[PDB]
Design a protein around this ligand. Structure first.
Ligand SMILES: Cc1cc2nc3c(=O)[nH]c(=O)nc-3n(C[C@H](O)[C@H](O)[C@H](O)COP(=O)(O)OP(=O)(O)OC[C@H]3O[C@@H](n4cnc5c(N)ncnc54)[C@H](O)[C@@H]3O)c2cc1C
Ligand SMILES: Cc1cc2nc3c(=O)[nH]c(=O)nc-3n(C[C@H](O)[C@H](O)[C@H](O)COP(=O)(O)OP(=O)(O)OC[C@H]3O[C@@H](n4cnc5c(N)ncnc54)[C@H](O)[C@@H]3O)c2cc1C
Ligand SMILES: [K+]
Ligand SMILES: [K+]
Lengths: 969, 941
């Protein structure tokens, strides 16, 4: 509305005029803080180094660490140490009211004398243990106890009447904020109910004490990952205390979901006949959400045009004010436009002042704050307190917030103010900027398949449903598939659920040597026509197989949950990876499929091109039973070979999915043959066969090396020297440097070691921790481990579950016993009673390179902890096995990271994240040494391993004449 | 511009006085269509394109195809008749009787004549004799006729002469038609062979006081032909009727002309010159560019039109000593000669004009009415095959030149790769270089060649003499042999050198290869001469070995620079993935004797430049050439231990080297038997062994060339002879089976065997010899037994003489009747034993081509697009060559290697090769800290 907007602009103009020349303290260049922010706003490279240096600072406990990091980041001594320490502490102190409860209450009271209310927060988020969650909870209880004893002596902040005991006459004097992720270390929508209950139970304990002193509790909103969980905690706590009005929730206007979330919540309040309070903010995690989404192949949950967040805020604030009778409103913004909008919308709607207040962050926007105090009178400061390390996330969000290009505050106080532009109706700005914003073979470029996203109710509902549906399909007999036809044999092997082995999923026919011979012959007969099929047409078959899998994504995942004990996310990622291989290798064949002219001499034409080899034997593992199976089979297929495929005997139903997918794609008969069989009956037979030209194997070293020896022999009638593609496992280390962010390292190490019960060739089985941070890291690692539960993978509350089968359990348990003798147990989890191949989550310390569990691949949930004296020994220890598949390092030292990139010679080295989870294209996967033969699946050199090059050279000069070609010399 | 205006006007006077390509292709191939089936198939194929053809042709082609051979007879009758009639407009006859008759209708029209024989390329001594005797036969017929010939109208002189001064009988002769192996590589032998035949023809010419003119052919033979003319002139100084052709398009011509005139004056003789522009322009430019030779011709057409006038003038000036024939169809060129002569008052007995008999009759006559003395160049021979073989315009070309002249990339800072220039025996310095360097090598014999380990020479008590296979009494040197102890020391040195070398920047590693390449280039003739003596390489074979070694160095240097930069993969924000390559460790390089520098350097330098360290075992019979690698890397300053030289007895140290746990890669080129054994032993992982051993293996072939029934035999025969017998057949790429279609078989085998008969077997230091001794006594005994096996299996067609006395000589041997079931159709002989297989149809030819366990190279000669496309698809070898020999793969142009029992699919000299010596690594970094990440340019954002 033009009339309302005019009032808003005019108020905004009066506001700017009143603060003309004033700047927030943070930008004051008479202080280190101000100069650093100035430099950061001027130079992106410096900003990154500066903010990263702030993050690593608390770990720099020695003079050596401090001076070296300064040189590495930016390139008597005691006093210089304290100069630097004081500077960083100044940056942290900028945004906090204290370090202890006592100091906070004291400064809280000085703030009241200046006329400011407060919402008090205990710094902390993303907790790592139950014990840490308890400390955080008890800190709030301690705060409330101290506040209960002081508030009686507080005169209520000046207001226009009401109760002089209350702030402004109506607001409770005690107001606290709590971050839900500080309340549960395993908060995750994958375990939606368990997360809600764990957080709710601690929140209730805090809320009960709040209600004791008639105070206000506001629940902060954190990353999008937990948004739905947090709304549910609020709804549940609210209904438990339906008559208590002082409970609030943060809603984030920068979220696309927020128009609906706010509508849902207002309707919900009406339906349940309760009142609510909403602190409307834009949102604090924008940089994170954008990146996190793209990295994890989820949809971006925030608006990406800044004005869209402003417009949404004005929309949503208006909706709230219109509903002031049921919804109390806290306007939390430092933006003069946004603030003036709220003031004029409230005026127009005639909203009583007891229904809305203004909030700003402590240590920011002081001139804006001063204006609100003068004009509105009701201004509350978000006041956090605590130490630098638990407050580091918050601190960095403030540094980013105040220096961002799109920041209102930066544009008002760090740049020359363009007031007319700053005060524009953001809806108008959205229209303009939205307007302005507006591969080969015809194929769109490759993108990894969307990962399951348990923020979605439908994705959360899908798994229990598909798992149940799978259970309606048990008991079937799975035949061989040879030359386009189903072939039954008499020999059946049941396949069972490792988490509940009495549950039989199906019976699998076994191929004898005769049937495998029939499969090889069919592959061989099909080969000439398939070899002669256009590469683009072969690619099209893979694309059709991918679409078929895409249609069955949840169903395919559910099968893996039951047949091999994949957790929901592990199962889904297995299927999406199979899909990625199909899409990526289709495109790779299209690229490689066109002959290239080579040389540039006239009178001559040379073309270099590729052809397939013949029949490929594909021998797949059980641990990534669809992904790796499909990767090897489809690479061989798309390059023009025909395949005889032996799935693992314990994931043969998953192996059958390859049959179903290629059948739906309509692949020609003979090109793909499915011959599950007993290795003792047909393993050597398949590898030895004279008509095999390629073997693609992923498995243990022992088996891989045996195949490599047997395959080397050229038998009578054998056409080619057999090509080997082999991936043979690892004994992978993660190094924890002394400057590592332990809050990051702990959950990544835990996932690397115990994800899918440790049954990955990439799994971390050695964590090599520098002596200087050893006790601190191990305490935190063990504490998080203790909170995790072992049990059936179909139950998403469980972190890990049964290993693959009875033989694997016996082998892993024997290794666990060896390890317990070699070192000392640091943690050994309980397991469920009754049936299931359960091995405890096991962590063993005191391990050294000479120990068997530091050398031999266990392939189970047994983590060796190695205490290294310095970074040089960590590297040496990392390199001390015969394997070299993956590795990880947590370090914030450029020099150490460079040393690791050069010297930690593994196939896939990961810096500051888990060392599992390689994605197609992004992380081509595979290594050398005893871990493989240097082939990397999902990368641009892989398909060539399944082919051989040919050249055709033509003499184009006939009778002393040759046609000129465009690229001739 | 006095003469110019006068030239323009002499010219003005004169001026008043897809389907087409398919048609040309059809006439070309027509003489080969010897069956109705062949004829209908080629009509169907050549004129089948519905879109690009007239609908008459398009519809006829389809009809021809549907009728098949049943429709052939009527087509042959019609097409032959029409083509014979067409040919009659360019060729004066195919019998002497028919010739004379038209030569007389020509005299009775105002035209003199020069007669030339148009036939197939001379590929044998018999064919040279047929050509020669055809001239003798025309001269006898002309002798018996020129008496009754009324001399052409004139102004003075003998009226029993043409124009009163010109002999009535004039013949032109093509030099290379007199000697099928004419080659400047054997300059003197080529001169003598041709001269001996030219002399016999000339005497018959002098017997009837006629004129003999010696044609000029391609640049390859120019200096040979000039020397022939001289030797012949001095033999008959006083006989004035001998002529030579000079080509104005050659940059050499100015000096060649001046030198010839001088030479004449000095020896006090007269000469005659037929000045032409040049008939081989496209050939010369392509051949020069394929070999990095100097381009011998101008490349602006006007430059040739200008050079002609320059040179015609100079000739006319010296008319007292040099008679002159103007041979051009260019009005400006004829005009400008005319006036230049008449502006220097050259008597008319000193210049005549020559044009093609095939020139349009009105143009031919209207030109006579201005120039007066026109001689017709009159081709003579078989009509059908003969036809298969067949204003501003008046401006001063020098002006045109000044104007058109006036009107007129690599990475890593390095120029783009280009193959090292091949030796050029048209150069006197290149011809002189081999005898010199061979003699210099002979001053260096008798040395003891030590091991080279960790930068040091290491001697052992066990010495093996290396000898000349063409003269085994000649001992070139003694080679120290490494026992297992020394090989272990080499392996340990390599392993100790590896970490520092792996960490050496790829651009720096490449720099060492570039320095080794410059070092080899500096010693090219010397390095070549050594191979001539140590392994019996012929001059060109030796030089090509060294140039290929240089090419591997230059190419692999560039490949490592390309591959050495990590590449970001993926495009997710908050994340950096970099994909890059690392070396494996110690490489065993086990090299063959047959390309002793090229293959050795290729495998060694590839391993070295990729960051591996090398333990190198040369063949026991080419260890001095192996020592050259030591010299070259030493001169490049390669760090100690990176390259180690350990010749040793395979029986003593071969398995030890392959089996060693510290070896990570084995690069082998050699026999299948040895390669497969290496593959089996390398597969095993021994205690302490770090990697699964990587195999790079090339294991030989049983390579076929298919001769389709429409093949051009003038090209196919010599290419097959070279492919089979070049370097005594000792190549993994050699043609050991020639599979010949039934309809062309008898003609092909006659010409091939007759060519083989013309060649000589003997010492490879003698450039006159085609091939020489095989590698050693063991090879000789083995090859000879295979020959005896073959002779029992099939039918010997040719077995050459060999020199008496010492030397490992195997006869050049051709055996027919060979079928796929035969041992010599299956087993690699590696010597000069060629199996000839008669295939009943093209389908069978393909099936026979694919009938061995090998698949290295192949070749096909065909002019059928459908047969060629079938070969490209189904003749599945690593390197298939169409319409040329199947040997001589060049770096980059022909990356080399195959699969089946021929190799493991590695191709030396190509863009996938270096990757086989490395393993890939990925580093993945999470760049997000505390909720923010640096924005990268290549991010999806
Ligand atoms: C008292 C208080 C409590 C808060 N509590 C929370 C909380 O519990 N949870 C939470 O997530 N946030 C919370 N916030 C908000 C957050 O911390 C920032 O303070 C706030 O987003 C800044 O907005 P603005 O109107 O002050 O400044 P502005 O400069 O107007 O707005 C900046 C905001 O715009 C958004 N933005 C930036 N770039 C883009 C873009 N390209 N596209 C779309 N949007 C963009 C971001 O949200 C950014 O913070 C709170 C804020 C206050 C004052
Ligand atoms: C009677 C007679 C005898 C002959 N004898 C021989 C012989 O023994 N040896 C021999 O080699 N040929 C011989 N020729 C052919 C001669 O050399 C030329 O091929 C042809 O005659 C030139 O034709 P032109 O002067 O009529 O016409 P033009 O159009 O004037 O001349 C064409 C010529 O220009 C030259 N040319 C074309 N393009 C370029 C370019 N881009 N740069 C530089 N030069 C260029 C070529 O030589 C080409 O032949 C003979 C020709 C005749 C008529
Ligand atoms: K199972
Ligand atoms: K020798």
């Amino acid at each position: 509305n033009s009339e309302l907007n005019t009032k808003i602009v005019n108020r905004g103009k009066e506001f700017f005029g009143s603060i003309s020349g004033e700047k927030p303290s943070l930008f004051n260049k008479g202080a280190w803080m101000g100069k650093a922010m100035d430099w950061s706003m001027q130079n992106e490279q410096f900003k990154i180094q500066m903010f990263r240096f702030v993050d690593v600072f608390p770990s720099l406990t020695t003079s050596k660490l401090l001076t070296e990091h300064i040189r590495e980041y930016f390139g008597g001594g005691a006093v210089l140490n304290k100069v630097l320490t004081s500077n960083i502490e100044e940056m942290a102190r900028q945004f906090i009211v204290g370090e202890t409860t006592k100091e906070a209450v004291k400064n809280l009271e000085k703030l009241r004398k200046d006329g400011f209310a407060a919402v008090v927060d205990v710094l902390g988020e993303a907790t790592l243990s139950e014990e840490e969650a308890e400390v955080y909870t008890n800190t709030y209880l301690e705060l409330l106890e101290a506040l209960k004893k002081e508030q009686g002596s507080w005169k209520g902040l000046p207001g226009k009447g009401g109760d002089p005991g209350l702030d402004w006459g109506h607001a409770p004097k005690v107001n606290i904020a709590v971050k839900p992720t500080a309340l549960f270390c395993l908060a995750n929508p994958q375990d939606f109910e368990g997360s809600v209950v764990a957080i709710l139970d601690r929140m209730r304990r805090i809320f009960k004490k709040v209600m004791e002193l008639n105070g206000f509790l506001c629940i902060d909103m954190e990353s999008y990952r937990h948004k739905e969980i947090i709304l549910e905690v609020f709804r549940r706590l609210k209904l438990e205390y339906r008559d208590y009005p002082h409970l609030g929730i943060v809603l984030q206007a920068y979220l696309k979901d927020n128009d609906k979330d706010l509508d849902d919540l207002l309707a919900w309040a009406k339906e349940h006949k309760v009142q609510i309070s909403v602190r409307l903010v834009k949102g604090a995690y924008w940089d994170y959400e954008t990146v996190k989404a793209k990295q994890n192949d989820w949809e971006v949950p925030v608006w990406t045009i800044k004005a869209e967040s402003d417009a949404a805020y004005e929309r949503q604030a208006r909706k709230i004010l219109e509903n002031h009778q049921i919804c109390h409103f806290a306007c939390a913004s430092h933006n003069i436009r946004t603030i003036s909008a709220v003031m004029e919308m409230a005026r127009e709607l005639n909203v009583p002042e007891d229904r809305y207040e203004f909030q700003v962050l402590y240590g920011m926007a002081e001139p804006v704050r001063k204006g609100i105090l003068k004009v509105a009178g009701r201004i509350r400061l978000y006041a956090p307190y605590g130490n630098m390390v638990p407050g580091m996330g918050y601190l960095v969000r403030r540094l980013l917030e105040n220096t961002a290009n799109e920041s209102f505050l930066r544009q008002s106080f760090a740049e020359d103010a363009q007031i007319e532009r700053l005060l524009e109706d953001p809806a108008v700005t959205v229209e303009r900027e939205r307007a302005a914003r507006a591969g080969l073979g015809g194929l769109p470029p490759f993108n990894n398949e969307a990962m399951v996203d348990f923020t979605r109710a439908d994705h959360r509902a899908a798994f229990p449903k598909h798992i149940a549906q799978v259970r309606t399909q048990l008991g079937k007999t799975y035949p061989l598939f040879i030359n386009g036809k189903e072939v039954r044999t008499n020999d059946l092997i049941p396949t069972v659920n490792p988490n509940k082995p009495s549950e039989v999923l199906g019976q699998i026919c076994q191929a004898g040597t005769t049937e495998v011979g029939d499969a090889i012959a069919a592959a061989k007969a099909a080969f000439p026509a398939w070899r002669d099929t256009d590469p683009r047409t072969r690619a099209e078959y893979l694309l059709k197989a991918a679409q078929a899998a895409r249609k069955r994504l949840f169903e395919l995942s559910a099968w893996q949950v039951l047949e091999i004990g994949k957790q929901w996310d592990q199962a889904y990622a297995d299927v999406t990876e199979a899909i990625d291989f199909l899409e990526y290798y289709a495109r790779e064949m299209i690229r490689l499929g066109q002959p290239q002219r080579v040389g540039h001499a006239p009178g001559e034409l040379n073309h270099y091109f590729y052809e397939p080899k013949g029949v490929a034997a594909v021998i797949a593992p059980w641990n990534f039973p669809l992904a790796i199976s499909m990767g090897m089979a489809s690479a061989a297929i798309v390059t023009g070979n025909c395949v005889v495929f032996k799935p693992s005997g314990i994931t043969s139903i998953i192996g059958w999915h390859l049959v179903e997918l290629f059948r739906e794609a309509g692949l020609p008969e003979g090109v793909f043959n499915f011959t599950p069989g007993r290795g003792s009956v047909m393993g050597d037979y398949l590898v030895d066969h004279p008509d095999i030209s390629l073997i693609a194997f992923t498995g243990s070293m022992e088996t891989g090396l045996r195949i490599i020896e047997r395959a080397a022999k050229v038998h009578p009638g054998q056409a080619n020297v057999k090509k080997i593609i082999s991936e043979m496992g690892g004994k992978n280390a993660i190094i924890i440097d002394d400057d590592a962010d332990l809050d990051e390292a702990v959950p990544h190490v835990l996932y690397s070691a115990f994800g899918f019960q440790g049954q990955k060739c990439s799994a971390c089985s050695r964590v090599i921790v520098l002596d200087a941070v050893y006790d601190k890291f191990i305490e935190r690692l063990v504490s998080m481990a203790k909170a995790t539960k072992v049990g059936p993978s179909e139950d998403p509350a469980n972190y890990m579950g049964a290993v693959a089968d009875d033989k694997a359990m016996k082998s892993i348990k024997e290794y666990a016993e060896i390890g317990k003798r070699e070192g000392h147990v640091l943690y050994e989890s309980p397991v469920p009673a009754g049936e299931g191949y359960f091995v405890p989550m096991t962590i063993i310390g005191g391990i050294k390179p000479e120990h068997r569990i530091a050398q031999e691949e266990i392939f189970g949930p047994v983590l060796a902890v190695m205490r290294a004296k310095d970074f040089d020994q960590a590297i040496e220890w990392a390199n001390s096995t015969q394997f070299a598949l993956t590795g990880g390092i947590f370090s914030r030292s450029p020099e150490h990271l460079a040393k690791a990139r050069r010297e930690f010679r593994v196939g896939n080295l990961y810096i500051n994240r888990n060392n599992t989870g390689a994605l197609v294209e992004r992380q081509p996967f595979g290594g050398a040494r005893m871990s493989g033969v240097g082939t990397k699946a999902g990368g641009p050199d892989y398909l060539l391993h399944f082919m051989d090059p040919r050249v055709v050279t033509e003499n184009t000069m006939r009778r002393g004449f040759a046609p000129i070609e465009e690229d001739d010399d």
